[PDB]
Write a protein that binds this ligand. Sequence first.
Ligand SMILES: Nc1ccccc1F
Ligand SMILES: [Cl-]
Ligand SMILES: [Cl-]
Length: 162
Amino acid sequence: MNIFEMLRIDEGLRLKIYKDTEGYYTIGIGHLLTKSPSLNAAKSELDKAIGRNCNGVITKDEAEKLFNQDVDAAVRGILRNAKLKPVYDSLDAVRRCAAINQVFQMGETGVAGFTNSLRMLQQKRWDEAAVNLAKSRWYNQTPNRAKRVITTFRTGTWDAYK
Ligand SMILES: Nc1ccccc1F
Ligand SMILES: [Cl-]
Ligand SMILES: [Cl-]
């Protein structure tokens, strides 16, 4: 198991514009195109990202390319964040994959108000952090996924992903 497999499992793969759990236009492996309600804006954004007139559809290789760039960006986002970096670098390898997953999903922004859980993770109070993390809109909106990431942080193992 590695970050790619893990997120591939959490985001799935779709080659045609779709709406995500929040109703926004996305494609591929959880690649958010726009928050706007205009399909045309989403298609324009898609073409800009791929470099060609896609007409709302991409190939698997294209999807995989967007994915690579998005994982990259997520980690880089973390390392560049003064509040995130120290936490991230205190964790082991599996738990670092759970931090990337959360960032991939919610953004560095979303994750920065998890201040209290961040502190518990840094202190390595696993069970405490797990309870704290569940107390969030994130867990109430996407419980099945949130449960998998939470277990991941609680246990430091890939059990939740089998
Ligand atoms: N949850 C989390 C997210 C990003 C960096 C570190 C973390 F602990
Ligand atoms: Cl791109
Ligand atoms: Cl879910």
